[PDB]
Design a protein around this nucleic acid. Sequence first.
RNA 1: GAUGUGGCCUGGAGGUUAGGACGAAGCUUAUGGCGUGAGCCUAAGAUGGACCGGCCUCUAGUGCAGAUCUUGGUUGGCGUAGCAAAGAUCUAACGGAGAUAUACUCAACAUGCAACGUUGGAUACUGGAGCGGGGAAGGAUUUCGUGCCAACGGCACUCGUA
RNA 2: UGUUGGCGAUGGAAAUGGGGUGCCCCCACCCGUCUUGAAACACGGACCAAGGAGUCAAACAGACGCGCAAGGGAGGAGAUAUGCCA
RNA 3: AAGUUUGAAAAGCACUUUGGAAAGAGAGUGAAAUAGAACCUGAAGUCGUGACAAAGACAAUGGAAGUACCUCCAUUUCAAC
RNA 4: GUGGUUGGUGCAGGAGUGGCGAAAUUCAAGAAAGCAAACCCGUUGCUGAAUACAAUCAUGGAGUAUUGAG
RNA 5: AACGUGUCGCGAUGGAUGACUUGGCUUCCUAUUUCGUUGAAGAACGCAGUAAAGUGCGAUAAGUGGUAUCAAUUGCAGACAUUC
Lengths: 117, 54, 152, 258
Amino acid sequence: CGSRRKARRAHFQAPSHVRRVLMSAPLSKELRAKYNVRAMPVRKDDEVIVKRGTFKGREGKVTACYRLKWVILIDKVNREKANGSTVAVGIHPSNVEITKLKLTHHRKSILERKDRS
Amino acid sequence: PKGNNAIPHVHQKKHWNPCSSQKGNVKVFLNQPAQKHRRRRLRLLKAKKVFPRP
Amino acid sequence: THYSRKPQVSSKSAKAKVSDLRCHYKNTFETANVINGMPLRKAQQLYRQVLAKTRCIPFKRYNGKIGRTAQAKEWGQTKGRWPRKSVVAMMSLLKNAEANAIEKGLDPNQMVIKHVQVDQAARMRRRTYRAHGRITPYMCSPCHVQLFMSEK
Amino acid sequence: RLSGMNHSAHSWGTGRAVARIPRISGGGTSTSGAGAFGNMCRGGRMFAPTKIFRRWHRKINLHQKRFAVVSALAASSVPSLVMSRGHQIGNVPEVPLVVEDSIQGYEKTKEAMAFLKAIAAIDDVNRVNDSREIRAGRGKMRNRRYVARRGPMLVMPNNKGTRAFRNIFGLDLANVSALNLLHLAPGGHVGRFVIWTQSAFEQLDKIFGTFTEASAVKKGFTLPAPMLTNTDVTRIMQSEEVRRVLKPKKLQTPTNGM
RNA sequence: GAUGUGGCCUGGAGGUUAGGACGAAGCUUAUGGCGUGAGCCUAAGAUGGACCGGCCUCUAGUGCAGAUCUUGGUUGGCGUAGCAAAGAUCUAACGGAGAUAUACUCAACAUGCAACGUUGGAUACUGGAGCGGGGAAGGAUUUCGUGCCAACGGCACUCGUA
RNA sequence: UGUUGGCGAUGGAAAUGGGGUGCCCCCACCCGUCUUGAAACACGGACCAAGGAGUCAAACAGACGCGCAAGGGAGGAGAUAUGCCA
RNA sequence: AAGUUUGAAAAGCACUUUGGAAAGAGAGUGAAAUAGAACCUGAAGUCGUGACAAAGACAAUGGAAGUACCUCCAUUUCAAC
RNA sequence: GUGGUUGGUGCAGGAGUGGCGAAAUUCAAGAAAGCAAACCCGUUGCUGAAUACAAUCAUGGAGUAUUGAG
RNA sequence: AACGUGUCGCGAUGGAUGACUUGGCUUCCUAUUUCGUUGAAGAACGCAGUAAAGUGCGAUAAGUGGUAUCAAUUGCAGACAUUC
Ligand SMILES: [Mg+2]
Ligand SMILES: [Mg+2]
Ligand SMILES: [Mg+2]
Ligand SMILES: [Mg+2]
Ligand SMILES: [Mg+2]
Ligand SMILES: [Mg+2]
Ligand SMILES: [Mg+2]
Ligand SMILES: [Mg+2]
Ligand SMILES: [Mg+2]
Ligand SMILES: [Mg+2]
Ligand SMILES: [Mg+2]
Ligand SMILES: [Mg+2]
Ligand SMILES: [Mg+2]
Ligand SMILES: [Mg+2]
Ligand SMILES: [Mg+2]
Ligand SMILES: [Mg+2]
Ligand SMILES: [Mg+2]
Ligand SMILES: [Mg+2]
Ligand SMILES: [Mg+2]
Ligand code: NA
Ligand code: NA
Ligand code: NA
Ligand code: NA
Ligand code: NA
Ligand code: NA
């Protein structure tokens, strides 16, 4: 929208099925060549790698897309607490990069739908 | 010290101004270009509908 | 959380603090200001003797229309008092600072108080009732206290 | 119209030792007995509240508008005034810059940018690109977030062929049949940089008329006559005719006395 | 009282020229320099953490010491005036962090004061128009047991209609 | 318009201007107000922050800027560029 | 009346130790704790503390001109002016 | 011959509404900073290798910034 | 001497300023646009594994059915993907 007020209100009051699309990540060069698609919505059990931040260069499997805090959680991305127990750190999906897709029938249908050829 | 002025007859002694106690009696023309655009659009649509009649 | 002054040598000093005491600020000001340059054992003895009422605390700034006594001649004044509620809290503060020094490994028999500062804290509010349907404030005035002592 | 005045406040009079201002009625809240109805009171009414029948628009004489457009067009052909306004025209072939009419068949922005680089308007386009930033002040909260300079303007004979140029940042497109003074003199300063297409250039004379012949579009309009035939007064001041009549030049502490 | 000023200052708009994470705005000053002045500019911050200056035009909810001015905070008086109707409590043993709390010398006093609950004993008061036992109007969980003691019970609490 | 000394040899220097605090000699009634007249025994006046008062419209006139001129100028509406563009 | 406006992320202070507890002293997270829970910045007014200057028998404040002491200020010079 | 504005039965398109649906750097450098006086020469020349700093000793976020290519 | 006075460095109390803004105010437009005895607007009492207010709902009660979508929701618990 050509109104900053309306645009920001829509973004911050988006429902769950809209946040799913808003939280998308790009694909690697290999997958971009294979599927002719530039980016996909992130999903649990995908494989990503971090391109920005203090965890840049780490790779792991996605364990949660919280969607209320606008973050995804990655199993290898974690830090310690005071009492020595481990907690996960949330990353924004546009800072990561998908390297392997969890493929299902509907997901392949979506990829065929979004194919640019 | 009223010098040599005209004798005024400005005629504004009723409650025309809207304030905290009065609704007012005024008419502004701020919708003039919008209404002109609307009228022209309607005329073009009507001509298209009744074609070929004038 | 730092103090208004710092010790010369920080490995031979100890510190203590209280934030919102719930003792009268004007009484604790006097009770704490009197031990500023004294050795620790001297300060503790003075507090015990004030509780026993054989010595007094000199009132020097906030002393408007208080009574005169003969125990104030020792400090060059004529007015003094025996505030037990403030004395028994300064005793606890001194005990804490001594424990800190002992943990650092110093000798409590050689420490000298070098810094004392008392300040006003936020004020709580109650109310009182006057003639003709009036209501008027009834406030509590607490204090902050901080101190450090160094080894001689 | 109702703001600041939505209470039932009254004055308490004298006798009670408070100032005589309307005060909010009732009890049980912190707002009870507080000042009301005044530019000086918190929550009160502003001095002279603003109305919607202020004069927002203005009337201008048709002849004066036409005069202003003509003057801005004339100023856009003096290369020093363009430089003073602020354009980068150092490597431009000529002023006024007229270009062939085959640029109306372009279909890709790559071709359009190649044409701009060949004509050497790219320096001013780059000035505009490099100037972009976020505005200072409250304006960026009110849908006015970004600012940039003004670049060259390209005039076409009709509304055809703009597809390749529409997206280039820092270039503005105009139609010769309706020229805007707000664009011919941004900020009120004359001297815009204009790139003319040949067809629009040949239409200018029919649109505006000449000093003797009248316009075919603006009915009965002719260019204004000049107050000075030759505007160079230093040459007159230094001429021989004046110097023959100038007046000839001429050649140019105790106090007591006793 | 009138008028002038390429006279100073504040929020926004059209232009133009510039600055900023190698640190913007804001804030501090025995930081000087400039100007008759309104004011402008530099320095330092052992302050701050993301925006903003100059010039030409345009525009306005545009400059505060005082109105028994409005809202919020503070302050001397001041540890002061007072907290005086309804007679009054004492003692031992238990309980409790609320003690029998020391640098040593030293038997002990002259260096841990003051105040609290329960039980027993003593001494008083109410005095049947009662600080007795039940109800209406009004109140609506204040009732009971176990805990707790930050705030409230204008002194205090280990106790409470909290 | 020259001449002769002192200090200054690259420093924690010397000098000259600012700034700060104390002292001496001299000078000096408390602000705002109304009033013929206020330092007044005439009214308002404990401190600080933020707010706080000649504005908008309409009729007329005079001076100054600009366009045209025995003429000047609309308004309302229409037409098509126009379907970013009030 | 009343912006929960800590921080990029709770990583929201494990453990030692004095205290009945609230808390204090260390240690740690974090770019910052001088960001420690209503926690961005953090003004004026008022108060505490350390150092220093004097002097309150002319209420203080104020003006003009010097001097004593200080000066995290500026400028100039250093062997030719 | 006409009537979809007599009624009963069938079945078409369009508009409106709702879903789907586009390009191109996470590019290189960890002084990641400058100068060569309108334009060009310049796709080229030459400027340090730093550690400073903090009222003997240790200590000191995220590249949408900069620069160059595309 | 003490108390008082003045200047500077550090610290409290207090909550201004600046930066931010899912809010207000004002102006325009579009249309198969206008409630109720077939019981409305308003008012009351309830409903979650955990649930005071608010929000949603009505003993089928933080919801049943149908379409579309596609893997969550999250303080803690608990549990057809060719879409149960
Ligand atoms: Mg008269
Ligand atoms: Mg007269
Ligand atoms: Mg009213
Ligand atoms: Mg008395
Ligand atoms: Mg009373
Ligand atoms: Mg009463
Ligand atoms: Mg475009
Ligand atoms: Mg404004
Ligand atoms: Mg000062
Ligand atoms: Mg105003
Ligand atoms: Mg008394
Ligand atoms: Mg009494
Ligand atoms: Mg009495
Ligand atoms: Mg009796
Ligand atoms: Mg009787
Ligand atoms: Mg009490
Ligand atoms: Mg009980
Ligand atoms: Mg803060
Ligand atoms: Mg003395
Ligand atoms: Na208001
Ligand atoms: Na003010
Ligand atoms: Na009594
Ligand atoms: Na007056
Ligand atoms: Na006077
Ligand atoms: Na890179």
